[PDB]
Amino acid sequence: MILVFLGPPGAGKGTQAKRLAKEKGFVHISTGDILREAVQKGTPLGKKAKEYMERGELVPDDLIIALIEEVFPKHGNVIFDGFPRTVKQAEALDEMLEKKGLKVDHVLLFEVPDEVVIERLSGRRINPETGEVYHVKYNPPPPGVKVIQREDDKPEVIKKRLEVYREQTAPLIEYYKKKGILRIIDASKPVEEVYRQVLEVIG
Ligand SMILES: Nc1ncnc2c1ncn2[C@@H]1O[C@H](COP(=O)(O)OP(=O)(O)O)[C@@H](O)[C@H]1O
Ligand SMILES: Nc1ncnc2c1ncn2[C@@H]1O[C@H](COP(=O)(O)O)[C@@H](O)[C@H]1O
Ligand code: ALF
Ligand SMILES: [Mg+2]
């Protein structure tokens, strides 16, 4: 089974993907997590991607396409979390998979309004050593866990990221609808309820 999680920044895609992957054995491919690792390591990819990410812009397609060619699991279940994020990325994914006799089985759209997105992102905090994600209101970190606010979760950068999503990523909703594989979830609900809806799709 190959899944794509699609939706605005802060919709809860990572939160749900991490759980589904552990509980059901999917390989989790988060382009954001992988890119943040590259930046830390200072690889050619990381050094180039950094300033796009800091501005809330997308990293250029060719870099992301190469990244996915390099890490795409040969066999077994996969969740692509935050990839694809452009039409050209989605076209590349389809081509890659077809060469392997595979296809995307379901694309889960995490629907949530802007006001909710903005609250989730402005209260998001991360453990920079593990990538674990918390929320100051909805899931605060316990004692002993040092967390930070991502630079891209600043108010002006959140604004830009939502703009970028609407212009470049939201067209994927129609791209996948027209493949017959889009499934809608209400990602504005609390975490447990979102997860129930995820399980319903993949079942
Ligand atoms: N259903 C939910 N309700 C409330 N807060 C949530 C929910 N899902 C995730 N969060 C919190 O909202 C923020 C965004 O979640 P995250 O999984 O990082 O989203 P994404 O991967 O889509 O950008 C995080 O701070 C997370 O703790
Ligand atoms: N598929 C992608 N294409 C382009 N840039 C991406 C992609 N995934 C992550 N990014 C970059 O990483 C940032 C964080 O994304 P994420 O961690 O998925 O919320 C984005 O705002 C982009 O700068
Ligand atoms: F996957 Al995001 F901000 F959209 F961590
Ligand atoms: Mg994420």
Structural domain for 168, as ranges: 1-203
Identify the CATH number of the domain in which residue 123 sits: 3.40.50.300
Q: How many CA atoms lie within 13 A of 76 on its CB side?
A: 10
Q: Measuring from atom 15 of ligand 2, which residue has the nearest CA?
A: 32
Using CA atoms, how far residue 114 sits from 2, 53, 63, 144, 163, in Å, is 28, 20, 28, 32, 10
Method used to solve the structure: X-ray
Q: Please, which residues bridge with residue 81 across strands? A: 5, 30
What are the backbone angles phi and psi of residue 200, rounded to the nearest 5°? -70, -40
Span from the CA of 73 to the centroid of ligand 2 (angstroms):
20
What is the C-alpha to C-alpha distance for residues 104 and 75, in angstroms, rounded to an integer? 13
Q: Establish whether residue 12 lines the binding site of ligand 3, counting it when its CB lies within 6 angstroms of any ligand atom.
A: no
Are the C-beta atoms of residues 48 and 100 closer than 8 Å to each other? no
**Number of domains observed in the structure of the chain:** 1
Task: Please give the resolution of this entry in Å, rounded to 1 decimal.
Answer: 1.6
